Design a protein around this ligand. Sequence first.
Ligand SMILES: *[C@@H]1O[C@H](CO)[C@@H](O)[C@H](O)[C@H]1NC(C)=O
Ligand SMILES: *[C@@H]1O[C@H](CO)[C@@H](O)[C@H](O)[C@H]1NC(C)=O
Ligand SMILES: *[C@@H]1O[C@H](CO)[C@@H](O)[C@H](O)[C@H]1NC(C)=O
Ligand SMILES: *[C@@H]1O[C@H](CO)[C@@H](O)[C@H](O)[C@H]1NC(C)=O
Lengths: 221, 224, 224
Amino acid sequence: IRVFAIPPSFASIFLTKSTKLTCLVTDLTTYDSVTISWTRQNGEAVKTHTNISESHPNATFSAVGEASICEDDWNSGERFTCTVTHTDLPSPLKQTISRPALHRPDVYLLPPAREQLNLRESATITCLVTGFSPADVFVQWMQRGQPLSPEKYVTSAPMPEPQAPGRYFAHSILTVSEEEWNTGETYTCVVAHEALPNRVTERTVDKSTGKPTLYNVSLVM
Amino acid sequence: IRVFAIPPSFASIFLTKSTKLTCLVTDLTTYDSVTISWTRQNGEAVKTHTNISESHPNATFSAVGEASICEDDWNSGERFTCTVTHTDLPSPLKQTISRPKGVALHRPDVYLLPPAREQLNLRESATITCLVTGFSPADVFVQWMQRGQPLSPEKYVTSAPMPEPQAPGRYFAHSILTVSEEEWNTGETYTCVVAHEALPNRVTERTVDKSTGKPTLYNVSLVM
Amino acid sequence: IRVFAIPPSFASIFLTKSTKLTCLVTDLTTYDSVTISWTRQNGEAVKTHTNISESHPNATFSAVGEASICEDDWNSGERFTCTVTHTDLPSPLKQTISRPKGVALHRPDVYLLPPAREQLNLRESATITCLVTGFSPADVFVQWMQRGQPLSPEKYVTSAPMPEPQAPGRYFAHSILTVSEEEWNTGETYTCVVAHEALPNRVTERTVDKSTGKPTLYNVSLVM
Ligand SMILES: *[C@@H]1O[C@H](CO)[C@@H](O)[C@H](O)[C@H]1NC(C)=O
Ligand SMILES: *[C@@H]1O[C@H](CO)[C@@H](O)[C@H](O)[C@H]1NC(C)=O
Ligand SMILES: *[C@@H]1O[C@H](CO)[C@@H](O)[C@H](O)[C@H]1NC(C)=O
Ligand SMILES: *[C@@H]1O[C@H](CO)[C@@H](O)[C@H](O)[C@H]1NC(C)=O
């Protein structure tokens, strides 16, 4: 009879610019005619839930409920609760959810290794973000102000640092070719975190990053 | 009554050079006299186990059976299954664990990325990551050794292996190492070793230094 | 009657990833239908001993045999005996051979030695020597690789370990690499590896290129 809900993380809010609600009910016998209605703490109705789900094949029933609530009370601490009406229990079970240090992340960009440029077949550029709380952040890539497709980069799950008790680190690699890296392709990444007052921190790099921008010495035969 | 299965990963059989297969059982009554016996495909004698775990505060009992086999036994293809016979199980549960064959092997690509100059400006911390990519299958072991002698295991965290966006059968891993700013431009090797079951020697190592990025041909200095 | 045995050397265990000991019996005559097999301390059965060798034409008898022995079992200290049952000697001859424990080990130190300038001017052949010293015991496996690919066994030969006169309990071994000078101008990997028991990962990769021991030359000291 355990009911688990997935609160909308900051990564899913900044991406589509439209936060929603969704609660799931498991460990229940499969049945029919189950209505899921969301109820706020005050006691007013919400948007009409549509797009019902089905039952899991493993002799279990799953129910879903959608809503459309703007950012007016989520940041304050409003307790969202969905109501599930099942025939097995006489009294519907209600489960409430809420919003659980704010360290500013520091984005560091690392140039590709010299051993990889000799292959002249691929290039890896990372977007390192360390010291951020909480986890589940969103980092994307933009090229000359135009974001790239999500299929070209994968964001790893944040993990706690070994020495830092309350700071997390994230990684975001980008698989590109070596030929393009020599003709620009800055590949500026932006991290979306709620701890930053501006919530945006982006840095740009190019081929001439290690140069102190004072001298340019090469070798000519 | 549930029973789990944790096959011996490649990273767990390298730091100790001794394989150990254990099966986990959960949702059991808090009672003593627990007998967990292992067997082979045909049925042979195994080694006894001890150090029985305690019970959970929510009235849940758990146990683990320790076993020991050879190194080539796991790669031979022989399946193993632990037998748990308690005093309240109508039917003894069983789960088969083996090594799933039929996976392509690729040599991992190790590139020890040096820390950026912007991080060193603060002069308060330094992060050294070791990029590991192009390895298959998963469960790769990454270790840090400072001048031969290794460091504490609680000084580096290895990210979970995930498939590459552009490669359907390749994985990438990360492992950062936080050090002091004054400990970067000193030396101490700082070699990243990666253990994977794809190389002929199964062990590779890549090391850099403060002069790795320099062309080591000319020393141009600016004096104000 | 003299019965010999070849213990599995460390250079062969790491190469084939399988310990295969061979029992050789000499000082005999020409017969047929021999019966020789190995046994453990407990007295169990072993693998087959097929693939016999032909008798030498000099009226000398020779016998070979392979067996599958786990690496952990050999390192534990189990003694193996080669049972010899022949018509010439009806008495069962016992030949116990194992690994003598109780010897201190030292971490080998690899020092790459680039070729001298007296050879590059000839433009005939390039020789790369990988001197390894400070290791014990003997039977160390040293090979060469070319970007994750081992070279041919007929190209590089590892010299037999010899005792160091200054070191009371250490040994040194050499491994030359005779290659063409045309392919040595650029250099791809030119890495040297050593397989020793005292090493943590048992493999130490040391690479060398054209510009390895050459320091900076154009030390510019401009000031404005
Ligand atoms: C130095 O200048 C040349 C031509 O002015 C240019 O091609 C080269 O890229 C410069 N060096 C660097 C490191 O950008
Ligand atoms: C010197 O300047 C010329 C043109 O201004 C440029 O092509 C050349 O690369 C420069 N020298 C170096 C070492 O970059
Ligand atoms: C290179 O130049 C820097 C300039 O300060 C100096 O400190 C360093 O010792 C020089 N290195 C060599 C090998 O000459
Ligand atoms: C290289 O030049 C720098 C410039 O100050 C000097 O300090 C250093 O001693 C020089 N090194 C050598 C080996 O000449």
